[PDB]
Structure 1
Amino acid sequence: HHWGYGKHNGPEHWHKDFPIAKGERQSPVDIDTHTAKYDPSLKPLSVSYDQATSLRILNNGHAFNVEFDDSQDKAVLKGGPLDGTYRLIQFHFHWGSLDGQGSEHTVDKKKYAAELHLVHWNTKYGDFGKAVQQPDGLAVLGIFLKVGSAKPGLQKVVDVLDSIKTKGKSADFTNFDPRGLLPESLDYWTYPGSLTTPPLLECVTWIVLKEPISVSSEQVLKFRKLNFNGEGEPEELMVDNWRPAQPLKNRQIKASFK
């Protein structure tokens, strides 16, 4: 009876195995654009993905992860609210059964069709496992998806999903350039929060881009053909793998832009 997004194991039940689900810095949150304050001391964000080395794509039963080689300082996030250097380890998405829901963060209560999470860990803790035990251990760059024009840089991801339909399947996924998933502008909101899946650890500085990327209806329809279940198990479409917005509590959301 493992956690998930179904009628009996979804986010309302997580607190029973992971009591930090009711904690002081949980994610995602609603971003109230009229309450977020412009912070002119935020530095420009530095996204350095030219040497990023993708390795593999895995259906983990909750999402799919595109995994990177993080054994050296290649693909790094720095600047903005961050102190020091954060190394790219994986990206994944959260998405809906229909275009009107799917994102984890919301903007003035607007839900986007999906949300990309590029996950980075703070190199001063030496490995990912140590980093998640620290309040400043991870930096997650969140990017909204809306349905419109295709994203050309996403199609190589869409075209491998058929080969990782079910839980536990993986495929070689080398030479993928995550620069192709970014919007034009790096304007962002930031706040301290958590992983949005169990174990819900409170180790994340969230950096949420204001500008969504456009993907096509055909591209997200292929996400929604994935399965939560393992091979030879009853088919459960991988849809609605998002956690809803959590209380803000004693937190401020800061904007990088006027």
Structure 2
Amino acid sequence: SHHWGYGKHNGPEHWHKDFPIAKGERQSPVDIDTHTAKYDPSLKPLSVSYDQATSLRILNNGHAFNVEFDDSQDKAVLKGGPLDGTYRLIQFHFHWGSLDGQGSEHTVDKKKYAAELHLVHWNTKYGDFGKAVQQPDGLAVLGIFLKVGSAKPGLQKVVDVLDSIKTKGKSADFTNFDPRGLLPESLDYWTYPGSLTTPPLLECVTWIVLKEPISVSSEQVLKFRKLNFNGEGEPEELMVDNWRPAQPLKNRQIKASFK
């Protein structure tokens, strides 16, 4: 049967048939043109409070892998930056390529990074994630580019569990993971209003994309590429190129926290 994905017959160019908002006015990702983004001195420093984060599980959902967190209290939150109020971390995941020259969803002056990390947070004034994704300010996604170079120590625990969630629907306990180990040195960022980059493509996201990429080793990203989109007992389809390309900016402004 038919299901959205990243192949020739069900990839991003087809999604609009199931999810018409794919052609909407606030779709993500976008290209970040550094000569059109404007420094905004009213933007605050980003406040990342992850000390009390409680990771729970890692899941291969057939499109990527999600590391899930306990979001029943303000244990890992994002405040400040462009945001009003408090956004709780619910999960993170990555998008990556079959080759080092592709994989990111956002681009910077058309440059594509090897991968991109998305830390997904929801606005606590809406009570739960499901209600937050019915609101134009329901979500905040922190996006972090990955380039291939030196290894990222804080990523290694993720890499070393992937063998246990090779196929769609597999999960593994994944407690005591500290997402601070995935951050770059600088928290300078670009921000713009957009959407989920996977179906249902809902236009609920304040995007906060960090300027500084993190470095991961070739071996770390190679291990991402050994995952499978398929379920156990089905033909093997490597989980690679699970990225949506840049979408039209339309009537949107990208602001920079730095000059």
Q: Structure 2-normalised TM-score?
A: 0.99
- CA distance in 1 between counterparts of 2:57 and 2:199 reads 22
Alignment partner, residue 143 of structure 1:
144
Shift of 1:43: 0.7
- CA distance in 2 between counterparts of 1:71 and 1:242 reads 30
Shift of 1:182: 0.1
Shift of 1:229: 0.1
Deviation string, structure 1 residues 177-213 (Cα, Å, up to 9, x no partner): 0000000000000000000000000000000000000
Aligned to 2:63, the other structure's residue is in SS state coil
- CA distance in 1 between counterparts of 2:187 and 2:74 reads 22
Shift of 1:224: 0.1
Shift of 1:220: 0.2
Shift of 1:132: 0.5
Alignment partner, residue 256 of structure 2:
255
Shift of 1:168: 0.1
- CA distance in 2 between counterparts of 1:206 and 1:72 reads 22
- CA distance in 2 between counterparts of 1:44 and 1:163 reads 38
Alignment partner, residue 212 of structure 1:
213
- CA distance in 1 between counterparts of 2:61 and 2:70 reads 18
Shift of 1:145: 0.1
- CA distance in 1 between counterparts of 2:8 and 2:45 reads 42
Aligned to 2:226, the other structure's residue is in SS state coil
- CA distance in 2 between counterparts of 1:55 and 1:17 reads 31
Aligned to 2:208, the other structure's residue is in SS state strand
Shift of 1:122: 0.2
- CA distance in 1 between counterparts of 2:97 and 2:53 reads 28
Shift of 1:48: 0.3
Aligned to 1:251, the other structure's residue is in SS state coil
Aligned positions, number = 258
Shift of 1:126: 0.2
| 2:180 aligned with 1:179 | yes
Shift of 1:72: 0.6
Shift of 1:218: 0.2
Q: Aligned-residue CA RMSD in angstroms?
A: 0.2
Query: Where do 5+ consecutive residues of structure 1 fail to align?
Result: none
Shift of 1:17: 0.6
Deviation string, structure 1 residues 56-78 (Cα, Å, up to 9, x no partner): 00000000000000011110000
Alignment partner, residue 235 of structure 2:
234
- CA distance in 1 between counterparts of 2:65 and 2:183 reads 18
Shift of 1:244: 0.1
Aligned to 1:84, the other structure's residue is in SS state coil
Shift of 1:227: 0.1
Shift of 1:85: 0.1
- CA distance in 2 between counterparts of 1:212 and 1:227 reads 26
- CA distance in 2 between counterparts of 1:182 and 1:43 reads 18
Alignment partner, residue 152 of structure 1:
153
Shift of 1:12: 0.1
Aligned to 1:222, the other structure's residue is in SS state helix
- CA distance in 2 between counterparts of 1:18 and 1:89 reads 23
Shift of 1:14: 0.2
Deviation string, structure 1 residues 155-182 (Cα, Å, up to 9, x no partner): 0000000000000000000000000000
Shift of 1:44: 0.7
Alignment partner, residue 8 of structure 1:
9
- CA distance in 1 between counterparts of 2:152 and 2:191 reads 25
Deviation string, structure 1 residues 128-151 (Cα, Å, up to 9, x no partner): 000000000000000000000000
- CA distance in 1 between counterparts of 2:102 and 2:26 reads 23
Aligned to 2:151, the other structure's residue is in SS state coil
Q: Structure 1-normalised TM-score?
A: 1.00
Where does structure 1 differ by over 6 angstroms across 4 or more consecutive aligned residues? none
Shift of 1:115: 0.1
Alignment partner, residue 113 of structure 1:
114
Deviation string, structure 1 residues 79-120 (Cα, Å, up to 9, x no partner): 010000000000000000000000000000000000000000
Query: Where do 5+ consecutive residues of structure 2 fail to align?
Result: none
Shift of 1:2: 0.5
Shift of 1:249: 0.1
Deviation string, structure 1 residues 204-235 (Cα, Å, up to 9, x no partner): 00000000000000000000000000000000
